[PDB]
Each structure stands twice: as structure tokens, then as C-alpha cells.
Design a binder for this molecule. Structure first.
Ligand SMILES: *[C@@H]1O[C@H](CO)[C@@H](O[C@@H]2O[C@H](CO)[C@@H](O)[C@H](O)[C@H]2NC(C)=O)[C@H](O)[C@H]1NC(C)=O
Ligand SMILES: *[C@@H]1O[C@H](CO)[C@@H](O)[C@H](O)[C@H]1NC(C)=O
Ligand SMILES: *[C@@H]1O[C@H](CO)[C@@H](O)[C@H](O)[C@H]1NC(C)=O
Ligand SMILES: *[C@@H]1O[C@H](CO)[C@@H](O)[C@H](O)[C@H]1NC(C)=O
Ligand SMILES: *[C@@H]1O[C@H](CO)[C@@H](O)[C@H](O)[C@H]1NC(C)=O
Ligand SMILES: *[C@@H]1O[C@H](CO)[C@@H](O)[C@H](O)[C@H]1NC(C)=O
Ligand SMILES: *[C@@H]1O[C@H](CO)[C@@H](O)[C@H](O)[C@H]1NC(C)=O
Lengths: 214, 296, 50, 49
């Protein structure tokens, strides 16, 4: 059985950030640039029979709302990421490098990037009992493990959820007293955004500000 | 300025040795057409094996002096090995143009590491010529750093179809070296190994042979941690880091909090160099007693 | 602006003096050190004039 | 170069693909007719009769 059904649509609302490095900061406004998810972008919401081969771009944003662990792993020689009741399976071959870690209403998010021959995994477990459109709450996706395989990946196949695409952008991450991400503001979205970016502050007063050149 | 008194080391925790015999002293080596890459982690390298034992033919280290090699911890060591003609050795250089540097593995301009080479008399040579080794000769476009080509399509020249349509202006991009014992020294095969690494980009994975020392506190002393070094008073901290976070910065993005790989605790760093002298006098003519002052 | 100018590489291998010292040699350390000296000195000149 | 009407077409020491691109000082040519057993004799590093 392989059924067909037209795809749906939805919009991102200020979701998806992760620590660009392993370093700690406290109550500062450190600025950085990387491959992030731009704010207010179309999210191709896939509702489940359907499992097409999704084109793995430079950076994705995988997030499932809540199920009974029907999702087990993903597809990426070929990377075999999958989870069983026993140790999570990490293998690399054309199944028809290997590694295992440990035997294994809400909301889960995952981002996949591949730079310098490194496969990074940022994730976050959020207990949320909201509705089809995910709510608006700022949170980060801490790193879990970095297994390097350094191979050529172009396609990924899943095993109700959302997917998105990352782009090279410059952000501004606000840090609290405990060094946790609480607020994020961009400066490639709206004129107010780049004003806030160049002034390096979260409040702007009346006046004129020079931003860039045309 | 306050002067530091002692020095402390909390640098290593590993014990395994880096696999190197197969890297250098062995004989099975891939062609320059397809160069193998090896991953090395969680062990200790030794310059004494490389610098001291034997002499080989090349010890050209770029970016970092060889004498200080096994003194700074690295991250994600990568090793590359291949065999080329001795006449082609000079072409392997940062930014130097060359046929192998144009159509085969090309060294980046900013490469930071070392290259070791030595001649092969007959180990990789045949009396009739070692034709297994091949070098790329013809290519439509140049390559980018750390790239490989696997297509064996017949090179295309002019408008005549090639790459399967054998004919005029069509040539095989790969040529046999044909190493022979009777060949000249410059034409003899040379065994060259390329090693590369990264510094201060990630937690320590491959550290030097130097062992750790005890841990003192409340006195500004020289400290080293995975490569980072500095001077300042060390003391306990109250800020709690994430289980993965190691370093610590400030508004100025300057190191002020470190995690000991042994004790696994939040350590504070405070400046110890400070002071300025102001001298007040009642005048040379009047008297000679003086009263020094320290500014801060 | 002065303080932030420190992190600038100024066309050298790195920015930390101690880091450059460890991985280089005194016979040819003059290049990076000289470039850093020139850059930071010029920055001080501008700041003092302002 | 694109005529493709020759039994022998090669540039020694220079790239025939890029010849209409750089300026020289002087150009000279010698023309003659030889046998089929003597074609390879006229070549750099080649000797014979
Ligand atoms: C940063 O952490 C501190 C310490 O947990 C938070 O301050 C409160 O500390 C008391 C200790 O008696 C706890 O019982 C409270 O639960 C803490 N507050 C919270 C909200 O957890 C402080 O709030 C934290 N900062 C932020 C922005 O959450
Ligand atoms: C999302 O896609 C739909 C149709 O593909 C389009 O009408 C809409 O404008 C897109 N969203 C934005 C913000 O442009
Ligand atoms: C789960 O799957 C892995 C995959 O190889 C297998 O090794 C393991 O035995 C499985 N465990 C159970 C309980 O099915
Ligand atoms: C990756 O694979 C695709 C499809 O085979 C190919 O077009 C692309 O050139 C490859 N890239 C690299 C870097 O190998
Ligand atoms: C490594 O650290 C552990 C725990 O701090 C300690 O017990 C052990 O002796 C250390 N070994 C080395 C080689 O540093
Ligand atoms: C094997 O390699 C080691 C280090 O890689 C070296 O010390 C040793 O001399 C080699 N054995 C030989 C050359 O027989
Ligand atoms: C010191 O001061 C006194 C009075 O102020 C004056 O008479 C005397 O000449 C001075 N001596 C010198 C060496 O300046």
C-alpha cells in the first residue's frame, strides 16, 4: 500500500535555535551567523499513507508533534539511523561505519547539518499539549552527539510532522543570567530587524539610524 | 605587577597510543589518483618517532614548528598518504602550481601541519614498470582543496565527442607511472604522507605526551588546559555550565571559566597582572623621604 | 571599540599572543608579532587623537 | 584546430587549446613531405635517418 494525497502548508512562527558553539556566555548579546531557519517561512506540513523521498538540502528542521513512537529513525554508502527498544542503531552501508549507544502531549524537534565532514544532532524534548499549529515558545536544541562520516548526502527519507530548510543568516541571541537562550532577533527580515541588529540592543528610540548601503 | 610563582598542568587523561606503523612504515599505499584519508582520535602522537628516528627525505612543517609539535593538543587529526614521482615532490606545497596540484589532490593555501616523504627504491617499483600507480593528467577544470575524482572517462579535446566515444582528440586522463629500479633518482617513487589537524575548535581529543600535575588554588600561576594557556588566580565557581560546555567567556569574549578534564568542575580565572606606581615627594631641596603609592 | 579591536587578527595566524608563541619559532616569529604591533599601535593612535 | 582534417595535429611545449589567446614576437614554419615510415622521426627527442 502506497497512497497519494496533495501536500498541505503552514508557516513557521519564530522557532528553531541552537548553540553555535560549545562555549558559555552570561547576560550578553553575542552576535553570530550560521545556517538557521528564517522566521515566518513556509513549512511543508506532511500529514499521514505518505513517505516521499525528501530532498536533503544544506540544513533541515525535523519536528514531530506527538505519537506513540511510530517514528523510529531516518535515512541518509548510506547512513542507517534508527531506534529500537534496545540500543539505538547507527550504521553506514547500502542495506537492503557502525555504532550503538544505549537501550531505548509533547513536542520534539531535530535539526541536521553536515559541515567539515561532521554530522551534528541538536534536539529538544518539550511537553506541549497544543493544537495542529505549534505554539510560540522560545527554546534551544542542545547537542547530543557528533558522529563523523564525512560522506556525500543528498536525500533523506522518514521512517503528522513538519520539515523545513535552513539558510545562511546572521542572528542575535540574548543570554540570561544562567546562560540560557531566551530571546532571538534577526536582521534579515524587516527594517526594524536590521535596525535592532546594528544598534545591538533590544530597544530603539526615536530618530534616524544608518544601516547599510544600496 | 604581581609575579607568578609556580605552574600547574591538568592536561591529559588518555593512555592509548596512536596507530602509526601502518600509516608510515608499511608498504601498501594507494595511488595519487585516489588518495586515502584516515581518522585518528583518542591517543597520543610522538615526534620522537618522526623527528628523531630515521631521516626519510622530507620534514617540511608548515604553519607550526616541528620542534613544538607534540606539545599542543589537536582536534580531528587527518592523515593522507600517497606515492608520487620524486620529480613531483616539489609540486606538493601551499599554493604552488603544478599538474598534480591542478588535476589531483591540491594542498590548501592555509594548511597547518607537516608533510613527510622518503624515496622508494624498488618497494613500489617493477623492472618492467609499476603501472598500477596512476596520476591524473587531463581534466576539464581544476580541483578544490581536499577533493577526489573517480570518473575514468576519456578526456575530450575540441568538438570531437569523447568520454566513451573514442576517437580523435580523445585521451585517457590517467597515465601509468611505470616506476623501475633502473629509473633515475628523481624518477624513483617517493612515499609521502600528508597530515593535517585543527586547533582550538573543539574539546581535546588527541593530546601530547606531557603528563598532568597537581592542582593549586588562590595563587596566580601558569595553567594549561587542552591547549589554552594563561596566567591568573584559580578558584572555585558558582555558575553552572551545561554538561557539554567546557570553556567560559565574558562580555569581551575572553576566557574566564574552565572545566578540568580530571576533576570536572567549574573553575574561575581572575586577572593577576595589575599595578601602577606614583611617587610623591616634598622636593629634593627640602628633604629626601618619599611615600610610594599604588594606583589600583 | 578599542577593546573589541583586540580580537581582530590583523592579517596574522591568530590573535592570542601566547597561542602564537607556542606554535611558532623565535627565528621567524617576527612576522606575526610585527604585524600585530603595527595594527594595535595604529588603533591606539586613532583613539588618542579622538 | 577545429578543422579535424589532419593526420597529425600536436603542439609541443605549448597548449594547442589556448593559442589564439597570447601574443608572440615572430612565427616561422617549415613544410616538407615524408614517407609513412618516417612520420615519427620528426619529433623532439627523436632521431634516425
Ligand atoms: C536561574 O537559576 C536560578 C536558580 O535556580 C533561578 O532562581 C530561582 O532560585 C530559586 C532558589 O531558591 C528556585 O527555587 C527557583 O525555582 C528559581 N527560579 C526559577 C524560575 O527557576 C532563576 O530564576 C534562573 N533564571 C531564569 C531566567 O530562569
Ligand atoms: C507559502 O506558499 C504558498 C503557496 O505555495 C504561498 O501562497 C505563500 O505566499 C507562501 N508563504 C509566504 C510567506 O510567501
Ligand atoms: C532492536 O533492533 C536491533 C537492530 O539490529 C537489534 O539488534 C535488537 O536485537 C532489537 N531488539 C529487539 C528487542 O527487538
Ligand atoms: C554527491 O552525489 C551527487 C549524486 O551522485 C553528485 O551529483 C554530486 O556531485 C556529489 N557530490 C560530491 C561532493 O560527491
Ligand atoms: C582521568 O580522570 C579520572 C577522573 O578525574 C582519574 O580518576 C584518572 O586518574 C585520570 N587519568 C589520567 C591519565 O589523567
Ligand atoms: C613501524 O612504524 C613505527 C612508527 O610508526 C616505527 O617506529 C618503526 O620503526 C616502524 N618499523 C619499521 C620501520 O620496521
Ligand atoms: C632650598 O630652598 C631654600 C629656601 O626655599 C633656599 O634658600 C635654598 O637656596 C634652596 N636650595 C636649593 C639647592 O635649591
Amino acid at each position: 500500500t502506497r497512497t497519494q494525497l496533495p501536500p498541505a502548508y503552514t508557516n513557521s512562527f519564530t522557532r528553531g535555535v541552537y548553540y553555535p558553539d560549545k562555549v558559555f556566555r552570561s547576560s550578553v548579546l553575542h552576535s553570530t551567523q550560521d545556517l538557521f531557519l528564517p522566521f515566518f517561512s513556509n513549512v511543508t506540513w506532511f500529514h499521514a499513507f505518505d513517505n516521499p523521498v525528501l530532498p536533503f538540502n544544506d540544513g533541515v528542521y525535523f519536528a514531530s508533534t506527538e505519537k506513540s513512537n511510530i517514528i523510529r529513525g531516518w535515512i541518509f554508502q548510506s547512513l542507517l539511523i534508527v531506534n529500537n527498544a534496545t540500543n539505538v542503531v547507527i550504521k553506514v552501508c547500502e542495506f537492503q561505519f557502525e555504532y550503538v549507544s544505549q537501550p531505548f502531549k509533547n513536542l520534539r524537534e531535530f535539526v541536521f547539518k553536515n559541515i567539515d565532514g561532521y554530522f551534528k544532532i541538536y534536539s529538544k524534548h518539550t511537553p506541549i499539549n497544543l493544537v495542529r499549529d505549534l505554539p510560540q515558545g522560545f527554546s534551544a536544541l542542545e547537542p547530543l552527539v557528533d558522529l563523523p562520516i564525512g560522506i556525500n548526502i543528498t536525500r533523506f527519507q522518514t521512517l503528522a510532522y513538519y520539515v523545513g530548510y535552513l539558510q545562511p543568516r546572521t542572528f542575535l541571541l540574548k543570554y540570561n543570567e544562567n546562560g540560557t537562550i531566551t530571546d532571538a532577533v534577526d536582521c534579515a527580515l524587516d527594517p526594524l530587524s536590521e535596525t535592532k541588529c546594528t544598534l545591538k540592543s533590544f530597544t530603539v528610540e526615536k530618530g534616524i539610524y544608518q544601516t547599510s548601503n544600496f | 605587577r604581581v609575579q607568578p610563582t609556580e605552574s600547574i598542568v591538568r592536561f591529559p587523561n588518555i593512555t592509548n597510543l596512536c596507530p602509526f606503523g601502518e600509516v608510515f612504515n608499511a608498504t601498501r599505499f594507494a595511488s595519487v589518483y585516489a588518495w586515502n584519508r584516515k581518522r585518528i582520535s583518542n591517543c597520543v602522537a610522538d615526534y620522537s618517532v618522526l623527528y628523531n628516528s630515521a631521516s626519510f627525505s622530507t620534514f617540511k612543517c608548515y604553519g607550526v614548528s616541528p620542534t613544538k609539535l607534540n606539545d599542543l593538543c589537536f582536534t580531528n587529526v587527518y592523515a593522507d598518504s600517497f606515492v608520487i614521482r620524486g620529480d613531483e615532490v616539489r609540486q606538493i606545497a601551499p599554493g604552488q602550481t603544478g599538474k598534480i596540484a591542478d588535476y589531483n589532490y591540491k594542498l590548501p593555501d592555509d594548511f597547518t601541519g607537516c608533510v613527510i616523504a622518503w624515496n622508494s627504491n624498488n618497494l613500489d617499483s617493477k623492472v618492467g614498470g609499476n603501472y598500477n600507480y596512476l596520476y591524473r593528467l587531463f581534466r576539464k577544470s581544476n580541483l578544490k582543496p581536499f577533493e577526489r575524482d573517480i570518473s575514468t572517462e576519456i578526456y575530450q579535446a575540441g568538438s570531437t565527442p569523447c568520454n566513451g566515444v573514442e576517437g580523435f582528440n580523445c585521451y585517457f586522463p590517467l597515465q601509468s607511472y611505470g616506476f623501475q629500479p633502473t629509473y633515475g633518482v628523481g624518477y624513483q617513487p617517493y612515499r609521502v604522507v600528508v597530515l593535517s589537524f585543527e586547533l582550538l575548535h573543539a574539546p581535546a581529543t588527541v593530546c601530547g605526551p606531557k603528563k598532568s600535575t597537581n592542582l593549586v588554588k588562590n595563587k596566580c600561576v601558569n595553567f594549561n588546559f587542552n591547549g589554552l594557556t594563561g596566567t591568573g588566580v584559580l578558584t572555585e565557581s558558582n555558575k553552572k555550565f551545561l554538561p557539554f560546555q567546557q570553556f567560559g567567556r565574558d562580555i569581551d569574549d575572553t576566557t574566564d571559566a574552565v572545566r578540568d578534564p580530571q576533576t570536572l568542575e567549574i573553575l574561575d580565572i581572575t586577572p593577576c597582572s595589575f599595578g601602577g606606581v606614583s611617587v610623591i615627594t616634598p622636593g629634593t631641596n627640602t628633604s629626601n623621604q618619599v611615600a610610594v603609592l599604588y594606583q589600583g | 571599540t578599542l577593546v573589541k579591536q583586540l580580537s581582530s587578527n590583523f592579517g596574522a595566524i591568530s590573535s592570542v599572543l601566547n597561542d602564537i608563541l607556542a606554535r611558532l619559532d623565535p627565528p621567524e616569529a617576527e612576522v606575526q608579532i610585527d604585524r600585530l604591533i603595527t595594527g594595535r599601535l595604529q588603533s591606539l593612535q586613532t583613539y588618542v587623537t579622538q
